[model samples]
Target: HMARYDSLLQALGNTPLVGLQRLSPRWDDGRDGPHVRLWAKLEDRNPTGSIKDRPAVRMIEQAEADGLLRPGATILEPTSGNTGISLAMAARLKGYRLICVMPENTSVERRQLLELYGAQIIFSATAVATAKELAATNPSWVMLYQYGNPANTDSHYCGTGPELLADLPEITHFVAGLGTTGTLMGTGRFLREHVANVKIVAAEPVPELYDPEILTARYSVGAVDAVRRTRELVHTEGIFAGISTGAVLHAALGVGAGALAAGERADIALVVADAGWKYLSTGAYAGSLDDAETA
Candidate 1:
């Protein structure tokens, strides 16, 4: 089965759902009652190597459809890294200029990729604040705010949620990092409707596009724990995922562990937001956890 797409953008979702055999508490059921498993949705397989690609493409298309974006328009947004890169790629392919306002201290690799994708970078002490001010003042710049954008959530609902359900219909829990709450809200809502007693978990570590009713649980991952779990993921399952992914993985494993303890059947699917490539320079992949946190 060859998957052929006319463009790289067309190859957006349908990321690989991989079973974490080593990390899962129980990969096989049988005498242990029902299996409690952990599955990783490798969102790094996206065109821009992150789940952000899903919403980036959708928001831009939504803006285009709504007549907010016209020919030779400019896109303005604030990001720590991944979303900026995704938007930069789509903006380049769609013949639009992108200005990404990000923290001055973000990873160098992300900056390089944004530049490579032809997105102009604006470093700020307060990235989101700067982006908001700029958008308010500049009428020409279209700020597709991921925090409030319906398209962002819709992308996960229409694309990611369906894809996950298609691959793992028996999915009992869905865990993803909460940035804009788009992924959790959209996918969570969709899965809630389809699966009975499905748990939608958010691994935060903010505003609008969030619905308290959609989530069953919320897990917070600190700097050290996130790094530790990230290492655990690479060591146990050989999945070189990003730091945020480590946070989500921690939540997924927690869920699986609880289910196993309670002797409940669980198929936990967690989102691996991106690969570890962009975070390599952050000293997270190597060095002691304390040192990584210090760095």
Candidate 2:
């Protein structure tokens, strides 16, 4: 059933937790051992079609109340794509202009989506140079810093953390992509409070992806690994997710496997931040596996 909302902004959070029965290695183990299942939460269904909606809306509302954002105000952000997309939607409707600073290795869809929202993009080797350097100098420009902002953490804590527990109370492990580091940090802390033994895992590009202390375990997913899982997700589960989500699924599978080795039951949940629609031109969903990895 469709939800009743006066505005699109009102229809945020409460994403579904879907069971990946076919993809789960041990969905029904019978007497062999406990069932190790994998659940995929479709965060891609947000109003703007990405999981960054939580932080995006949360921060925007906070900024508005805090007198940071106003009509005709120019919002500056140093983000890859989703964050910028989220901001662009709110900025457009709220009568603000947005400019984004993006780094390399991001998908083409991200760039185009921001442009679609009428937000300006500034690509760079470092991507966030002006935001960091002129933070003090450009005090008037409202920079929505996702990394240092407490609103990012608070967003997940109030929204995602509570929602996941409501849908899957038996969730044993929670895995998320280490993109802005907010997803894991915010959701992980909340899970720890409710689920005593929940393993908070981070699927990262490398060792320096996030603070090592915040995670219970980490899976190193390189370009090759992310590309591999992205294809597997599409073929096996019929879920078309991006490369970043591929890394998240890889970690979810890892934790499930560990439970099988130890003869323990497990219920792992991962997020699909966004779909592969934007990554099609990048050959992340098609072409040979080797061909996709090169990008």
Candidate 3:
């Protein structure tokens, strides 16, 4: 039987966990003797349809508990999509006004979701500069700055990290899509401390193909950078990421194969942060990396 929550906010945690049968088959080369497996934490099943619920819930809880948010106070934040949507739902449930600043280039579905939840929209420039400049001026707003917020990381550390370890003691490798670096850093810290013989890997978009010139830091995705940073800290591939989530999956296959080759009892886990629904416009699923370069 499925456990039910009294309210949507209460339904934020305890997402379904699934094993990766497809990945396991692909990564199992004869060399490894079929010891390696893969799993996925389907965080996309959250009420907001993305992993952002973890931090959104945490930030709201912290603010209310700390008295930072009084009755009728406005909750403000910046996001490309998922965070904003999550925050909108949380804030609305708690009776706080939600004002989200998002890039104008964000998908129509994201904007509609925010509006459906009664969030006030503030559209920033297509260029990243507009978001930063607007943020500097909006000092009164309670900014749930997803990028540098420790709460973002702590959510995974205190929740997702421990949960994964408890479920998969034999997990040899952990991989997650890079976003705020919170998921990687927080879960990485937990697994390293509790789960012995575990390796942490990050997946990210290929910078050369997606971000050629590195124009806007705000517009840029952090998973790629997070993976690059992780690589520097470890002897292994450091970071393996897909240019898209599929790319991240591709990297996971490589890592699992290598683990098998080394005669290690191994399994890989990935955080399926969101459905590919939002990225339809980016053509990440249908378009080829080579074609992306030419365009």
Candidate 4:
């Protein structure tokens, strides 16, 4: 039978939960640790090529339901890239105009994709000051505000988190990127409550300017602080994201190793967040550090 809903928005949630075969040998060798398995949520499969679509839909739904968005209203938000693109797609589907304020230093592909989705782009400084200034002056705008918005966290807590547990009740560890903190906090909270002894770890860039190691940290800011204190998320490595994502992966592996050493069974899960394709200019995919240095 054909689907009941005619639009792609109807299928925004319920992403795949798949086990990783690549990590099995590593786990078996005691390299990744005992009974620990690795799984990827595959959020990149979303319509916008990232997981941000989940919350973007929820936010717009809430805005429309709450009377914050009237017909033909313009939606505005600050984004590194993905969220804006996702929201732009959602707004376009719903016939609302979308505008995004983003750091000038953000990758080119992000800006290009948002434009492709019919989102108006406003360039801000690479620093946080410009974002705040733009937001303050545009009170009439319908800001998605993913960083501090409860909708960002709630969408995962109420949607992605519960869905993961239902599909993989055995999941024991959750690891994700520390962007706006929404994806991590919301999913982490849900896993902690549902799974016994589940470990939640965050990834971040090493603070040293010349370091190339990937590491994970036990602590990360919550959704509220992620927006108000954007500078805190910045690393001395100066905004190269592969290191940031690598940090999270390193932490997840560390947790898996520790669990195996203690003879405990665990599983490692990491959020791909977005593909490395958009980051070519950042040199994250290049073999040498020169690409990163130029970035």
* Model number with the top TM-score: 1
TM-scores for all candidates? 0.94, 0.90, 0.76, 0.77
TM-score of 4: 0.77
The lDDT for every candidate, in the order shown, is 0.89, 0.83, 0.66, 0.66
Tens-digit per-residue lDDT, 1-295, candidate 1 = 4998878888889899999999899999889689999989999999989999999999999999999888888899987578888999998888799999988887777678889988998899767778888878766688998888999999999999999999999999999998888999999999998999899998966478878699999998888889999998999888999899978988888898899999999999899999988788777889888888985
Count clashing residue pairs per candidate.
0, 0, 6, 1
RMSD of 3: 8.4
Candidate 4 lDDT by residue in tens digits, 1-295:
5546788888777777666554432345454445666666667667776788988988898888888888777877777567888998899999888878777786777778888889888887543455556546754566656766777877888987887888878787778876677777788778777887776676654221111222224644332222211222123212223234455545555676677668777767766564445655554444444535455
Q: Tell me the tens digit of each residue's lDDT in model 3 across 114-194.
A: 898789888876423454565456444466667766778788889888888878887767787666777777778788888
**Alpha-carbon shift of residue 186 in model 2 (angstroms):** 0.2
Per-model RMSD to reference: 1.9, 2.8, 8.4, 8.7
Model 4 steric clash pairs: 203-248
Clashes of 1: 0
Query: Considering TM-score, where higher is better, how would the candidates rank from best to worst?
Result: 1, 2, 4, 3
Candidate 2 — worst ten consecutive residues by lDDT sum? 206-215
Clashing pairs in 1: none
Per-residue alpha-carbon lDDT of model 2 for 171-242, expressed as tens digits? 999999877788888898899999989988888883222445668987888888899888999999899888
lDDT of 1: 0.89
